Amino acid sequence: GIKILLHPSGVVERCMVSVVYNGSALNGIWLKNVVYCPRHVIGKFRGDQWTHMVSIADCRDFIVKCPIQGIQLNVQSVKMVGALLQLTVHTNNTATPDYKFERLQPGSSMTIACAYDGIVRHVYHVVLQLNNLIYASFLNGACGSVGYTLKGKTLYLHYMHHIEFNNKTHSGTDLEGNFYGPYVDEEVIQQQTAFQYYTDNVVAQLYHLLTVDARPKWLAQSQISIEDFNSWAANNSFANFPCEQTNMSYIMGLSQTARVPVERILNTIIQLTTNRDGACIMGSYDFECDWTPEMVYNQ
């Protein structure tokens, strides 16, 4: 079958820690001898107050515990890197994997290890949207939770949570400390660019054809050219196709398996915007960007 595949969370569970500072509690990840955590654990500061407040923060006020390894950590140094804190600790984490800090592009997926008090409670799957937000699920204390992928034995850290907006959207930084999109870790009202479907992923969602119904009734009989679709997409909140040229090899492979050219899929998308009438496609009632062409093709 074709499923949403999550990367196993064990390697991340053993590096998670809890970070508590003067009544404020969240999560951090412990790699080598450094704990990375959101900087707002020491207060709800604004603009350019961060550098001074971090320079004033007492290292002994950072209470860091790694619950699975059952040991307490002692912060020797604090250094702000971007919107993250780098608390250098005395002990090296023997569970540290081979890792790399890798920034995600919009339309790519990752597994979220959503933790509380340094303990992973739930894992789930998200895709970075074109507004540079993720549609995740977080409560108080969930900040510091990470989004990641795995390739062999290497852990690819992509994301660390900071903030939730009014419409239950979520924003954070990569592990080098830079936010996705223009959002910041402040309680101010921040503008959001209008939503736009990642067209490659919606196409991968319809390619349902391979697991649910090879010939559904809502699948268009006629084709539309990529170019004619892209003129329509500009006025209907769909990104220009293809969003990534590398997805074309996956999409071409899916088209041969399903025996349905992508031009029919694209024209199905156009018709569905006025014809869907509650149709359920790959188990969802709307267009979803969670299915990437790579995951659907490779599994």
Ligand X SMILES: *C(=N)[C@H](C[C@@H]1CCNC1=O)NC(=O)[C@@H]1[C@@H]2[C@H](CN1C(=O)[C@@H](NC(=O)C(F)(F)F)C(C)(C)C)C2(C)C
Binding to a second copy (CB under 8 A): which residues in 130-149? Answer: 135-137
Residue holding tokens 């995600």?
104
| Residue 61 per-residue DSSP state | G
Q: Does 162 bind a second copy (CB under 8 A)?
A: no
Dist. CA 167–CA 190, nearest whole Å: 12
Taking contact as CB under 8 A, which single stretch among the options 19-27, 113-121, 177-185, 237-245 is the one that binds a second copy?
113-121
Binding to a second copy (CB under 8 A): which residues in 237-276? Answer: 268, 272, 275-276
Q: Which helix (H) or strand (E) holds 159?
A: strand 154-164
Residue 8 amino acid letter: P
Would you state the structure tokens that stand for residue 85, as one six-digit string? 């804190």
Binding partner of residue 186 among a second copy, ligand X, none, CB under 5 to 8 Å per kind?
ligand X
Interaction site with ligand X (CB under 6 A): 26, 40, 44, 138-143, 163-166, 170, 185-187, 190
Count residues binding a second copy (CB under 8 A): 51
The answer to whether 179 touches 123, Cβ cutoff 8 Å, is: no
| Residue 141 per-residue DSSP state | T
Q: Which is nearer to ligand X, 36 or 138 (CB)?
A: 138
- N-term to C-term CA, the chain: 9
Binding to a second copy (CB under 8 A): which residues in 270-299? Answer: 272, 275-280, 282-283, 285-288, 290, 299
Q: Which is nearer to a second copy, 83 or 269 (CB)?
A: 269
Q: Which is nearer to ligand X, 20 or 270 (CB)?
A: 20
Dist. CA 97–CA 226, nearest whole Å: 43
Cβ atoms within 10 Å, residue 14? 18
Would you state the structure tokens that stand for residue 79, as one six-digit string? 């250094």
Binding partner of residue 125 among ligand X, a second copy, none, CB under 5 to 8 Å per kind?
a second copy
Q: CB 119 → a second copy: shortest distance, Å? A: 9
Would you state the structure tokens that stand for residue 31, as one six-digit string? 């790699």
Dist. CA 176–CA 157, nearest whole Å: 10
Dist. CA 105–CA 89, nearest whole Å: 32
Q: Which is nearer to ligand X, 14 or 162 (CB)?
A: 162
Q: CB 1 → ligand X: shortest distance, Å? A: 10
Phi and psi based region of residue 86 (left: phi greater than 0; alpha: psi -120 to 50; beta: remaining): beta
The answer to whether 95 touches 67, Cβ cutoff 8 Å, is: no
Q: CB 265 → ligand X: shortest distance, Å? A: 28
Binding to a second copy (CB under 8 A): which residues in 61-90? Answer: 68
Taking contact as CB under 8 A, which single stretch among the options 9-17, 23-31, 82-90, 248-256 is the one that binds a second copy?
9-17
Q: Which is nearer to a second copy, 21 or 250 (CB)?
A: 250
Residues that bind a second copy (CB under 8 A): 1-11, 13-14, 68, 113, 120-126, 135-137, 168, 205-206, 208, 211-213, 216-218, 268, 272, 275-280, 282-283, 285-288, 290, 299
